[PDB]
Structure formats: structure tokens, C-alpha cells
Design a protein around this ligand. Structure first.
Ligand code: NAG
Lengths: 48, 49
């Protein structure tokens, strides 16, 4: 009777709830610091 | 020897290093096709070619 509405229609930041491992998918809320160790094979010299 | 009527040196992405880290482009409007010696007149920078 009084379940209200599920988190598939209530959860903030516009992300959808699934139940097989119970995960919240595609939540766009914060900022992620990231560090990449690009290999030297990608870099080419300024001459080429 | 061909005569260079005008020449302009523009250099981008210079790196002072043991390797040849700098590259400069000479724009020229000479009068005849031929071979020139290119030289750097400083004791601090040396040309590869
Ligand atoms: C069950 O839930 C609804 C939803 O609010 C409620 O209005 C209703 O009175 C409840 N009972 C029945 C018998 O439907």
C-alpha cells in the first residue's frame, strides 16, 4: 500500500538502480582526480 | 652560388639539450635553385645540417 516510489525514480544525480549486485549506474555528481602514466612510445619528438 | 633575396627565421619548440632539441624554419625567396651552406654563428647553438 504505502511503499512510496522506488529509488529508480527518486535517486539524486539522475542515476539508475539495478538489483543483481545492487548497483547505482551512471551517477554524475563529483570530480575524479586522475593520473595517467602515458608510455614513451606514444610521444614523438618535436622534429617529426 | 644562389643569392638569398630575403630570409626569415621562425623557431618553435626549442629545448636546450644534448640532443638536437630545437627546430627552426627559414623562409626564403632566392633567385636560382642551388645548394647553400647553412650555419649558426654562435658558439652556444650548433646546426645539425
Ligand atoms: C492500498 O494502497 C493504496 C495506495 O495508497 C491505498 O490508497 C489503499 O487504500 C490501500 N488499500 C486497498 C485495499 O487498496
Amino acid at each position: 500500500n504505502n511503499s512510496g516510489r522506488p529509488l529508480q525514480e527518486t535517486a539524486p544525480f539522475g542515476c539508475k538502480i539495478e538489483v543483481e549486485p545492487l548497483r547505482a549506474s551512471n551517477c554524475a555528481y563529483g570530480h575524479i582526480p586522475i593520473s595517467i602514466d602515458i608510455p614513451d612510445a606514444a610521444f614523438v619528438r618535436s622534429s617529426e | 652560388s644562389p643569392t638569398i633575396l630575403e630570409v626569415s627565421c621562425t623557431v618553435a619548440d626549442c629545448i636546450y639539450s644534448a640532443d638536437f632539441g630545437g627546430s627552426l624554419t627559414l623562409q626564403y625567396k632566392a633567385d636560382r635553385e642551388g645548394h647553400c651552406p647553412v650555419h649558426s654563428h654562435s658558439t652556444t647553438a650548433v646546426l645539425k645540417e
